[PDB]
Design an enzyme around this catalytic site. Sequence first.
Site, PDB file in Angstrom:
ATOM      1  N   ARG B 128      26.410   6.394  -4.801  1.00 17.75           N
ATOM      2  CA  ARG B 128      25.584   6.625  -3.638  1.00 17.75           C
ATOM      3  C   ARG B 128      26.052   7.806  -2.811  1.00 17.75           C
ATOM      4  NH1 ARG B 128      24.974   1.473  -0.524  1.00 17.75           N
ATOM      5  NH2 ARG B 128      24.244   0.999  -2.651  1.00 17.75           N
ATOM      6  N   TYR B 155      36.411  10.839   2.960  1.00 16.62           N
ATOM      7  CA  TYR B 155      37.218   9.654   3.177  1.00 16.62           C
ATOM      8  C   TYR B 155      38.582   9.803   2.494  1.00 16.62           C
ATOM      9  CZ  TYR B 155      32.675   7.762   4.625  1.00 16.62           C
ATOM     10  OH  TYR B 155      31.479   7.565   5.260  1.00 16.62           O
ATOM     11  N   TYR B 159      38.016   8.691  10.628  1.00 14.26           N
ATOM     12  CA  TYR B 159      37.064   9.386  11.470  1.00 14.26           C
ATOM     13  C   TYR B 159      37.768  10.289  12.445  1.00 14.26           C
ATOM     14  CZ  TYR B 159      33.819   5.945   9.625  1.00 14.26           C
ATOM     15  OH  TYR B 159      33.045   5.172   8.784  1.00 14.26           O
ATOM     16  N   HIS B 180      30.660   5.430  -2.707  1.00 15.78           N
ATOM     17  CA  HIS B 180      30.959   6.797  -2.248  1.00 15.78           C
ATOM     18  C   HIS B 180      32.204   7.361  -2.935  1.00 15.78           C
ATOM     19  CE1 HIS B 180      27.944   5.900   0.617  1.00 15.78           C
ATOM     20  NE2 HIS B 180      28.714   5.275   1.490  1.00 15.78           N
TER      21      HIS B 180
HETATM   22  N1  LIG Z   1      36.312  10.261   6.450  1.00 14.43           N
HETATM   23  C1  LIG Z   1      35.026  10.594   6.501  1.00 14.43           C
HETATM   24  C2  LIG Z   1      34.159   9.971   7.416  1.00 14.43           C
HETATM   25  C3  LIG Z   1      32.817  10.336   7.458  1.00 14.43           C
HETATM   26  N2  LIG Z   1      32.345  11.286   6.560  1.00 14.43           N
HETATM   27  C4  LIG Z   1      30.952  11.768   6.515  1.00 14.43           C
HETATM   28  O1  LIG Z   1      30.346  11.578   7.821  1.00 14.43           O
HETATM   29  C5  LIG Z   1      29.257  10.615   7.659  1.00 14.43           C
HETATM   30  C6  LIG Z   1      29.215   9.636   8.860  1.00 14.43           C
HETATM   31  O2  LIG Z   1      30.235   8.681   8.712  1.00 14.43           O
HETATM   32  P1  LIG Z   1      29.862   7.171   8.326  1.00 14.43           P
HETATM   33  O3  LIG Z   1      30.996   6.365   7.806  1.00 14.43           O
HETATM   34  O4  LIG Z   1      29.182   6.529   9.563  1.00 14.43           O
HETATM   35  O5  LIG Z   1      28.735   7.327   7.199  1.00 14.43           O
HETATM   36  C7  LIG Z   1      29.548   9.891   6.309  1.00 14.43           C
HETATM   37  O6  LIG Z   1      28.346   9.376   5.731  1.00 14.43           O
HETATM   38  C8  LIG Z   1      30.110  11.037   5.455  1.00 14.43           C
HETATM   39  O7  LIG Z   1      29.115  11.954   5.008  1.00 14.43           O
HETATM   40  C9  LIG Z   1      33.185  11.880   5.642  1.00 14.43           C
HETATM   41  O8  LIG Z   1      32.684  12.714   4.897  1.00 14.43           O
HETATM   42  N3  LIG Z   1      34.545  11.543   5.602  1.00 14.43           N
END
Ligand SMILES: Nc1cc[n+]([C@@H]2O[C@H](COP(=O)(O)O)[C@@H](O)[C@H]2O)c(=O)[nH]1
Lengths: 251, 251, 251, 251
Positions: B128, B155, B159, B180
């Site tokens: 996905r 990831y 964040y 992912h």
């Molecule tokens: N550690 C990270 C956290 C978020 N992201 C990106 O930011 C988007 C928003 O974070 P989230 O977990 O809400 O989907 C996520 O879908 C990824 O595209 C990322 O690439 N790496």
Amino acid sequence: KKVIIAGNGPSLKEIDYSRLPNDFDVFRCNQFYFEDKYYLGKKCKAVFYNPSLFFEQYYTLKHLIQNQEYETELIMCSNFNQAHLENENFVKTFYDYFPDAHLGYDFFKQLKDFNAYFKFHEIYFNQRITSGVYMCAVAIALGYKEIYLSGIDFYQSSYAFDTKQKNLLKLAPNFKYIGHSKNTDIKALEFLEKTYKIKLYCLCPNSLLANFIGLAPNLNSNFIIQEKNNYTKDILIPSSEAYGKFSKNIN
Amino acid sequence: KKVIIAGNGPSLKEIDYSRLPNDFDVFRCNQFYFEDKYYLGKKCKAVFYNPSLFFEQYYTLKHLIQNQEYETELIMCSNFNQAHLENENFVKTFYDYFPDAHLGYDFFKQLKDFNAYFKFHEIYFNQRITSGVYMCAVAIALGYKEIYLSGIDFYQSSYAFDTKQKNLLKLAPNFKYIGHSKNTDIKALEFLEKTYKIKLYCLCPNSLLANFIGLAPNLNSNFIIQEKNNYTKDILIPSSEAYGKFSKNIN
Amino acid sequence: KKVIIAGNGPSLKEIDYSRLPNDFDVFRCNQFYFEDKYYLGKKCKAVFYNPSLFFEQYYTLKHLIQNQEYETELIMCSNFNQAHLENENFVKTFYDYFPDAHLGYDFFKQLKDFNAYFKFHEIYFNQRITSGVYMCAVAIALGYKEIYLSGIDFYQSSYAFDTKQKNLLKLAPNFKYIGHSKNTDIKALEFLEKTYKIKLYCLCPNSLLANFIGLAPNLNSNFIIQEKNNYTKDILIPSSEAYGKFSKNIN
Amino acid sequence: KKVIIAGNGPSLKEIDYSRLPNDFDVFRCNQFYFEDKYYLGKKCKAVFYNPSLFFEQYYTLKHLIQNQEYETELIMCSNFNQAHLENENFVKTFYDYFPDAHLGYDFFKQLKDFNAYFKFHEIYFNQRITSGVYMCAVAIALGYKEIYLSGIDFYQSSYAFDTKQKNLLKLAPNFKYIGHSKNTDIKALEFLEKTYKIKLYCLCPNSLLANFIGLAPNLNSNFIIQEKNNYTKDILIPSSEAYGKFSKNIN
Ligand SMILES: Nc1cc[n+]([C@@H]2O[C@H](COP(=O)(O)O)[C@@H](O)[C@H]2O)c(=O)[nH]1
Ligand SMILES: Nc1cc[n+]([C@@H]2O[C@H](COP(=O)(O)O)[C@@H](O)[C@H]2O)c(=O)[nH]1
Ligand SMILES: Nc1cc[n+]([C@@H]2O[C@H](COP(=O)(O)O)[C@@H](O)[C@H]2O)c(=O)[nH]1
Ligand SMILES: Nc1cc[n+]([C@@H]2O[C@H](COP(=O)(O)O)[C@@H](O)[C@H]2O)c(=O)[nH]1
């Protein structure tokens, strides 16, 4: 352009290639990829699959393409908008599960007299046309005016190949329909021809088809029959995770 | 206009601002508002939210706007028309519950080759794409030709901010997807780029992203990073009356 | 043309008729016909009825017309496409049960910013605008630019007439909503006015409305207030056969 | 062109043929084929059938055509989009089961004032117009301006033929509606005439119809009444396989 529409009967292997037209697209269906040589080349304008194994056939086709065994521009499911012939949620959500594919009924239904002809025979007399005729209908709906037929033998042994392969047998153990006949296919083809002013030709002089449909004309054409090696000759089966996600759509 | 698309990874805080393009719109998603500074300004062209917390995120966004923390022209739900990924009645009644918002699939599905690419990988291989790539797709569908990426880190800590906030944890205790990967996002971006003839840039030289996507060019640009004070850094939770009215739409 | 929109509050009886505009249509709603004089004439451009008594109100209106008490060009149901506010099959089959009527939401939803405003307040804060404001919205959607208000008093006694009539009490025993307030109606009207660049006027100098909406200008206009005699002053109740045929649509 | 609309009452046999217009289409309905002579010829512009025996009537019509007893250009089901009058799945899937036919409501509903008139009388007063009037409505919707009526007698013995035939009696044992009256049909016809500015004529001077509708003018016309021999004078019954496939659509 012209069209060659191929069923998967033994005559697929008995094409008179000097009767092959100049400028053509190819329509294939179902287990076409079980063929042991490229009887009509690697390149398809369209490939058609029944609703009942569409999930697995779509997955298999993606492997065929990626593995460079075939290519096709269009992907069709041969549906009819009949609750007794296909799953209702499958058809409703189709374009969202298979966004590069088409429901064949989008095209079939544009031939209103034929949709009526098909429906009256299926519903009231249990006489059903085969996928080979369905493909002719879709071709006429797409604007093809000259249709060259092969591999349509009316189940007079069964296929141009051995279909008893382990995955297909697991999916559909029955490979080891009673509404099909030669008469129902012949009468349906004759109806399409007269109703839509198109021309039907037969590429296989030794088929039972040639008793009813005139032969395509000799044009001195040549065609190379490329052999196949280490090729995909069984349907592929998706993971249980895949199935769990599609389960509202199969039954 | 150009577009900056921001995920919420740590690199959101490590933008090389001299590489900021002249004339841009900003796309934000999900918990973007937890950021401790306005890393990309207060003004969004669009903000995207997952179906599963859309009810609460919409309510929160209205507070953000009213409280003058952000503004946005567009509000998107990142749906896919897949029964395993979103509630069916939520999607069916969406425009009547949220009349100033959009279902992102209205735009996503306009990229047919990509919808097919996404669906085949999700359904059959459980691979996905993340919201960051979804946003790129929606941007290409909206006609954006140059896309500047930040906050996408795959990831590799989690964040650019602490997401362990009390309301979000109550709503989704799991904040203390396995489909992912960096590969799935990278391959999806490469597909969008080549398929739709658009240009991808990376604003964060120190992200893992920069291994794959070329850097946006230095333009001597300046940008003021406005600090945030007494700001909204948790999701808001609607009353039980609100929930009772939306309950056919959540599960 | 201009529009006079009338709620059914006591101020309906306290119109300053010298402030009546030249060339107007009249919008009435709900139990308007209980009025003891023709405060705004017999001729309506549109009459609006809530979904919950629409079946009985439609039947009653046909009697009103046939009996020459009123006429109206348009018949509207004031719906919102919200499962908690109206029956779903009622709305789905509406045009086939009432082919000369309209669902008001067909018009309401054309004011997207207002539909959003209404929905956010109703769903999240249980603040609901009254039918009088709904009618203003539908009028703006129909292209009316100048709106003259009467009979809107914010439930500060209840109606310009005695609504405790035997059939209505049988249908809705409660006549002997808590989400309504003067503030919610006033803020909604102010929003419509500024958002859609239309003009609101108040025909009743002694209403609480006049604290907020400027008075319509004196034009020396005259108006005859025709008395009513032996008139219909209760809702009519359909036969059990009628009810049996509509029963999928009420609850 | 002009239209002759025929019900199946005794006056079907008492047409004054010198009053037959020059250039006409014929509308027939229900058990019309039970007639013992071709009172209006073999050629129909349209034939109409009730929803409740449509499955069997469609099958029978195909035999009539194939056997060269009649032809018709159009095939109509006389539905109303009312759950108490027809099966919902029948109407939803209609065009896919009967692709050369039409739902009459597609045309009926184009006469909005009349759809409203019909619905108000049916739902609230249990006054229902007969198929003969339904056909007039569909004709006006199709653009016919002059309508010639026969076989409409208001059940004042029952049919121009013996309908007590064994298959029909098996299908509908009741052949050995209480909402019908002469008044309801007469008032509905008068409404169509004035509302849509069309002209109604009566071909049967001795019908009760002639008390209300002026006679078509004498034109010295001639008409040959072809006798019928060894003809189809009962409805045909489909196989159990057919029924099993249509069973979601009957009840
Ligand atoms: N550690 C990270 C956290 C978020 N992201 C990106 O930011 C988007 C928003 O974070 P989230 O977990 O809400 O989907 C996520 O879908 C990824 O595209 C990322 O690439 N790496
Ligand atoms: N023995 C055969 C096998 C297949 N065919 C045709 O080829 C089509 C594909 O084969 P299949 O059984 O998958 O439907 C089939 O629908 C027929 O149209 C045939 O005509 N005779
Ligand atoms: N006391 C009153 C009664 C009715 N009204 C208005 O008139 C409208 C019709 O009255 P009703 O209770 O049927 O909704 C109502 O929705 C209000 O907009 C009012 O403003 N004050
Ligand atoms: N005795 C009769 C029988 C039929 N009809 C008309 O002919 C139509 C067809 O007959 P039927 O009973 O099938 O509806 C019927 O609907 C009436 O419009 C009639 O008017 N008087």
